[PDB]
Design a protein around this ligand. Sequence first.
Ligand code: NAG
Ligand code: NAG
Ligand code: NAG
Ligand code: NAG
Lengths: 100, 50, 51, 36, 41
Amino acid sequence: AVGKEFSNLERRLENLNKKMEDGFLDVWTYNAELLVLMENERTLDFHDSNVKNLYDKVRMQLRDNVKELGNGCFEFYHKCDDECMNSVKNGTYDYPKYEE
Amino acid sequence: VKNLYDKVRMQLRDNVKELGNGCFEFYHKCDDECMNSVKNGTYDYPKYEE
Amino acid sequence: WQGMVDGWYGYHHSNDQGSGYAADKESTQKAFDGITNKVNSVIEKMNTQFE
Amino acid sequence: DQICIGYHANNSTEKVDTILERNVTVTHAKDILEKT
Amino acid sequence: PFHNVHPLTIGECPKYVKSEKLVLATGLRNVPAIAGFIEGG
Ligand SMILES: *[C@@H]1O[C@H](CO)[C@@H](O)[C@H](O)[C@H]1NC(C)=O
Ligand SMILES: *[C@@H]1O[C@H](CO)[C@@H](O)[C@H](O)[C@H]1NC(C)=O
Ligand SMILES: *[C@@H]1O[C@H](CO)[C@@H](O)[C@H](O)[C@H]1NC(C)=O
Ligand SMILES: *[C@@H]1O[C@H](CO)[C@@H](O)[C@H](O)[C@H]1NC(C)=O
């Protein structure tokens, strides 16, 4: 229960109650705003690294039977049909079966 | 700085070799127009070959 | 590199016409603004009041 | 032919701030401050 | 966890802050056949 009743001869005490409230308020406001800002930067970095990590997962399995295009895409040096494309998504691309 | 290295690596593609010390070397003559294009992000990869 | 003075990140350009250090304007400017905002978040979000 | 890797985008105009950036548009956000 | 309705409350309440907006990103940066993650969602 926030807020206390003080008499007019207790101003030096009322002021301490005020100070705790203002004090804790600055602590929580400062921490809440930095927590949000720090988390949002970490969040966006997280998402960006997740898509890059996916790109590398794929790059590592596709190995030398592909070329990177430089725009976040890969192209095959062999015909790649639905079974092939699904295997890349699945992480089961049968690298030894294909060649340039 | 690593992200810059990769931005460059991705555009230079296969017409260069990495040196391993944070530098690239071309397999074709690369003059000021070429070097400026790499800095600019406009390197015309299809125009050059080893 | 000691030599580049025109930004935080940049290039050497050592072609046959000469070697010079150039800031990657995009990289330097974005990082620069990032750091400036960081410093300001730490300082500007601090509340003050008369006490 | 090619297989591209990417991520979700939408019609959101919801913006958040971070330590390094301000007015950053995100696809989804949660308001953790109760205002009403 | 936080609210900005009024500084004096009675009950089991969120922390009061001097703020208009505490918003966590939960999504991806909404960056607005030819490309992947390099150019946008
Ligand atoms: C991966 O391939 C196997 C064999 O065809 C299949 O049983 C499995 O469901 C596939 N996984 C995914 C995520 O598609
Ligand atoms: C990139 O090249 C174009 C065409 O020559 C030029 O107009 C532009 O100013 C260059 N950008 C930079 C940063 O050098
Ligand atoms: C964006 O708005 C258009 C209408 O202008 C709608 O057709 C489309 O599905 C919406 N896209 C998303 C991702 O919300
Ligand atoms: C952030 O958005 C607010 C509107 O909510 C605007 O007044 C302010 O200028 C923007 N800040 C920057 C750096 O763009």
